[PDB]
A paper describes a structure:
In this study, we report on the identification of a distinct class of sirtuins (SirTMs) found primarily in pathogenic microorganisms and show that these function as protein ADP-ribosyl transferases. Members of this sirtuin class are genetically linked to a specific subclass of macrodomain proteins, which reverse the sirtuin catalyzed ADP-ribosylation. Moreover, we show that in Staphylococcus aureus and Streptococcus pyogenes the sirtuin-mediated ADP-ribosylation is dependent on another posttranslational modification—lipoylation.
Numbering used by the authors: 3 to 6, 11 to 292
């Protein structure tokens, strides 16, 4: 039962059923498993101009790049926001996971910033977007702690850009200091704008953790890579260490070495995330 000859799906369905609570951490692998990829034809088709100019390898590298000027920044980012936030369709793995989680006491933390939880109909009170969202903007000088949005301006930038530049008059500026807006994103050097809504999410996530310091708590980590381990992977390892009755189950095909203090509490499930979540749902619902 509560331990880390069954298939991966069978094992995962058994653990979720037996769990007292789930703390679910979701990264980029879950969206890639549903087809929302950041390398290969999806990127090449969407950004052939930028790829030819800069030799970008992938769409995540491109989204972090320090572009030539704000006209170029917004030409790239407007198209990036439409692809990954305004028009990205619902993912089946998100729907399948939701059907499982709605039977459980759970909370989600994600380093993703796409629309996936919203088009799949998740309750925003149960999700912490710790790395912001592509649909939001912040002052580029971080001059005050408020986020903004304007999807109509995004569509105008897509329609009116030419030659990798938005017209200068379309660039949006902060009302407080007149610096250009930028996408709400976290930088190592500058941090992120963290407004009232961000803190309300963080408080809900911290309250759920405080209620589940004991018991059969399943720390379920889905598609979380190496990029920013301080937000999900490392804190999950620490929570599992601190609660000897917790379990760490990671859906991943890279075999990151688990800390000694959680070796007896850890399981790696390597099967393709979409197919694994689908198979687990079918077992779980009977
Ligand atoms: Zn400002």
């Amino acid at each position: 039962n509560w331990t880390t000859n069954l298939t991966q799906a069978e094992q995962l369905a058994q653990l979720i059923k037996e769990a007292d609570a789930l703390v679910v951490g979701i990264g980029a692998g879950m969206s890639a498993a549903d087809g929302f990829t950041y390398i290969g034809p999806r990127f090449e088709t969407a950004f052939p101009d930028f790829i030819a100019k800069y030799q970008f390898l992938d769409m995540l590298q491109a989204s972090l790049f320090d572009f030539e000027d704000w006209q170029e920044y917004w030409a790239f980012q407007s198209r990036f926001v439409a692809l990954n936030y305004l028009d990205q369709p619902v993912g089946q793995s998100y729907l399948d996971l939701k059907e499982i989680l709605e039977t459980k006491d759970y909370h989600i933390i994600t380093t993703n910033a796409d629309n996936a939880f919203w088009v799949a109909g998740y309750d925003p009170h149960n999700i912490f977007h710790i790395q912001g969202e592509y649909g939001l903007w912040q002052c580029s000088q971080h001059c005050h702690q408020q986020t903004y949005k304007d999807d109509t301006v995004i569509r105008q930038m897509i329609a009116e850009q030419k030659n990798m530049k938005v017209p200068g008059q379309l660039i949006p500026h902060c009302p407080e200091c007149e610096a250009p807006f930028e996408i709400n994103k976290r930088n190592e050097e500058k941090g992120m704008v963290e407004d009232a809504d961000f803190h309300a999410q963080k408080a809900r996530y911290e309250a759920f953790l405080s209620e589940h310091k004991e018991g059969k708590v399943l720390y379920l980590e889905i598609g979380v890579g190496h990029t920013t381990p301080q937000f999900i992977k490392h804190p999950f390892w620490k929570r599992v260490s601190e609660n000897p009755n917790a379990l760490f189950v990671t859906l991943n095909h890279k075999h990151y070495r688990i800390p000694l203090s959680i070796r007896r509490q850890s399981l790696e499930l390597t099967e393709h995330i979409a197919q694994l979540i689908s198979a687990t749902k079918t077992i779980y619902q009977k």
